């Protein structure tokens, strides 16, 4: 339900970089072990395929 200080900073960074809202950014990071490099790769892979749900990019 809540994030550590370090996770909070990672979340804000990833939301900005990916363009996803905070909740979907948190989902991507959690799905990838709070590993930013891995999360970014995973995101980029799915984005290119057109498979990320459009709700992920809404405010």
């Amino acid at each position: 339900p809540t994030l550590s200080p370090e996770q909070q900073e990672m979340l804000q960074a990833f939301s900005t970089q990916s363009g996803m809202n905070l909740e979907w950014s948190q989902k991507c990071l959690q799905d990838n072990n709070w590993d930013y490099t891995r999360s970014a790769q995973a995101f980029t892979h799915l984005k290119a395929k057109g498979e990320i749900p459009e709700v992920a990019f809404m405010k």
Binding site: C28, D31, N32, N33, S39, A42, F43, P53
Partner: peptide, 9 residues
Amino acid sequence: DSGFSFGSK
């Protein structure tokens, strides 16, 4: 583990 997930896990 239903629904959308990111990365290879």
